[PDB]
Antibody
Framework: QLQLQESGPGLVKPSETLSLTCTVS??????????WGWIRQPPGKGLEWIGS???????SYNPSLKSRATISVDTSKNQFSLNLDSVSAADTAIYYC?????????????????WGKGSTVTVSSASTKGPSVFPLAPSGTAALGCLVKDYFPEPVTVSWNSGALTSGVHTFPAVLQSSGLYSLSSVVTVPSSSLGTQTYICNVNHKPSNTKVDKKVEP | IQMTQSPSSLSASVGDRVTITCQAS??????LNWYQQKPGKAPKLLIY???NLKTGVPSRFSGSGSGTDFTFTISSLQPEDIATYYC?????????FGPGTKVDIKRTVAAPSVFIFPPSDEQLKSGTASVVCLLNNFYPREAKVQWKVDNALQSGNSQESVTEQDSKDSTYSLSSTLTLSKADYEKHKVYACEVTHQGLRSPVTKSFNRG
C-alpha cells in the first residue's frame, strides 16, 4: 500500500537552502484524511517535527523553524517538498517524510502512520569525496570483509553478492578519522570450506559522489 | 514545561516485563502515541490514542494512562524489541516527541571469536596500511583490544567501532583498525592484536608475520 520516498541532495553549503522532495506512491496525496509532514533527527538526538501540509496547500509549522521552513505540495506529481533556508551545522540531520492520519467529527485527532526511509543531510563547506574500497582477506568458520575508507559525507551502503549474502554480515558504524573523513568496514563469516570455491563480492554505494563499486574478496 | 520519559535507558533480560513512562507537557486533548525506532530505521507507530494497537503489532505491547501521565509496557521482552521508544503528543498545534527511552538486552557472557586482517596489496600501493582486528558475537560490550607490533605496544594509531546489539542473539561485534604509513608498516615483522574479555579464560592473541 502507501509508500513514501525522500529525494534530495546530501551536502548543502552553509547559509544556502536545503531542498527535499518526498514522492508518494500506493495512494493519492489528495486524500481528505491525510496530512504530509517532515520530521528530522539530528545525530544522536531525538525527533523534531518541522511542519505539515494539507493537499489543499495549507501548511502548519514548528514555531522555532517557521521563519526558515517552507513546505509545499504538488498534486500533479503526487509529491510534497521541504525547503529550509539559511542552513547551518545545526541542521545536519536525517530528514524523514511521513503521512499523518487525521480522524474525528468534533475534534481532529492525529497520528503519524507511514514514514519514508529518511535522507541524510550534511551541512558543510567541504566537497564530496568517494571512498576507496579494499578487501579484508581471510587467513570451521572464516571471516572476510571490505574496508571502505576516506569518504564524505555520510552515508555509504554496503551489501554482499548483491544481497544474496545477508547471513552473518556486520556492517560497522562509520568512524570519524583524524583526517576529517569517514570510514567503515563490513565483514561476514562463512564456511571456511567454501573459500577458493565460492565468490564473495561487496557492493559499496556512496551516492553524494555517485560512486558504485564492486570488490571481489579472495583468500 | 517539557515532555519527559523515564528511564532514559534500561537493560532487561529476555522475558522481562518492561514498563516505561511518559509525561506530557500539559493535559492532553489530541492522541498520545508511541513509536518504536530500531537502530538504522525510521520510527514505527505501535500504539495510537494512548492504548490502541496498530494492526499487526504484537500483543505483548500495550499503553495506558490519562491526563499527563502515560505508560508503555512490553509484557515479555523479546530480542527483536531492542529499540528507542518515543511518546508523542500534539498540543498547541505542534507535534512534540518525548526524549526517548533506549531499551537494551542483558544476556549471559559470551566469548568473542577473533580474526586479524593484513593490509591489502591495493592499499599499500597507495602509501597507507590499515590492519584490522575483528571480535565477533560477544557479550558484554566491554572488551580490551591491544595492538602489538614486534611485541611493542601501540597507542594513538587505532580506532574502534562497535555494532548495535544483534536482534536475534543480543550480542555485539567490534572492529579495531590500526593505521600506519606504508613506510612504518614495512619496518616491522609481526602484527598482533591481543583481546581481553570477560568470556575468555585468558587473553586471546591473533597475529601475522609480514612477508
Amino acid at each position: 500500500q502507501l509508500q513514501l520516498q525522500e529525494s534530495g541532495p546530501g551536502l548543502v553549503k552553509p547559509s544556502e537552502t536545503l531542498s527535499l522532495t518526498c514522492t508518494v506512491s500506493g495512494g493519492s496525496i489528495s486524500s481528505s484524511s491525510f496530512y504530509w509532514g517532515w520530521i528530522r533527527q539530528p545525530p544522536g538526538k531525538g525527533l523534531e517535527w518541522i511542519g505539515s501540509v494539507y493537499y489543499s496547500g495549507g501548511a502548519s509549522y514548528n514555531p522555532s523553524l517557521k521563519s526558515r521552513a517552507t513546505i509545499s505540495v504538488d498534486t500533479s506529481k503526487n509529491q510534497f517538498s521541504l525547503n529550509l533556508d539559511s542552513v547551518s551545522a545545526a541542521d545536519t540531520a536525517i530528514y524523514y517524510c511521513a503521512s499523518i492520519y487525521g480522524s474525528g467529527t468534533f475534534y481532529y485527532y492525529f497520528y503519524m502512520d507511514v514514514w519514508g526511509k529518511g535522507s541524510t543531510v550534511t551541512v558543510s563547506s567541504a566537497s564530496t569525496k568517494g571512498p576507496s574500497v579494499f578487501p579484508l582477506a581471510p587467513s570451521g568458520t572464516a571471516a572476510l570483509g571490505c574496508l571502505v575508507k576516506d569518504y564524505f559525507p555520510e552515508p555509504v551502503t554496503v551489501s554482499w553478492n548483491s544481497g544474496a549474502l545477508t547471513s552473518g554480515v556486520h556492517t560497522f558504524p562509520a568512524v570519524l578519522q583524524s583526517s576529517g573523513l569517514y570510514s567503515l568496514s563490513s565483514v561476514v563469516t562463512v564456511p571456511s570450506s567454501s573459500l577458493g570455491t565460492q565468490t564473495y563480492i561487496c557492493n559499496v554505494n556512496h551516492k553524494p559522489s555517485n560512486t558504485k563499486v564492486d570488490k571481489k574478496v579472495e583468500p | 514545561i517539557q515532555m519527559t520519559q523515564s528511564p532514559s535507558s534500561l537493560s532487561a533480560s529476555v522475558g522481562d516485563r518492561v514498563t516505561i513512562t511518559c509525561q506530557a507537557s500539559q493535559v492532553i486533548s489530541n492522541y498520545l502515541n508511541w513509536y518504536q525506532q530500531k537502530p538504522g530505521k525510521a520510527p514505527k507507530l505501535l500504539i495510537y490514542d494512548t492504548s490502541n494497537l496498530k494492526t499487526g503489532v504484537p500483543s505483548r505491547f500495550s499503553g495506558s494512562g490519562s491526563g499527563t501521565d502515560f505508560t508503555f509496557t512490553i509484557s515479555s521482552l523479546q530480542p527483536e524489541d531492542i529499540a528507542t521508544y518515543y511518546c508523542q503528543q500534539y498540543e498547541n498545534l505542534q507535534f512534540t516527541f518525548g526524549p526517548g527511552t533506549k531499551v537494551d538486552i542483558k544476556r549471559t557472557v559470551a566469548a568473542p571469536s577473533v580474526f586479524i586482517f593484513p593490509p591489502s596489496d591495493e592499499q599499500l600501493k597507495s602509501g597507507t596500511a590499515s590492519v584490522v582486528c575483528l571480535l565477533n558475537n560477544f557479550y558484554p560490550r566491554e572488551a580490551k583490544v591491544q595492538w602489538k607490533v614486534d611485541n611493542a605496544l601501540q597507542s594513538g594509531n587505532s580506532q574502534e567501532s562497535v555494532t548495535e546489539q544483534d536482534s536475534k542473539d543480543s550480542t555485539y561485534s567490534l572492529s579495531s583498525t590500526l593505521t600506519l604509513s606504508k613506510a612504518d608498516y614495512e619496518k616491522h615483522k609481526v602484527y598482533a592484536c591481543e583481546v581481553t574479555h570477560q568470556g575468555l579464560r585468558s587473553p586471546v592473541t591473533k597475529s601475522f608475520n609480514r612477508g
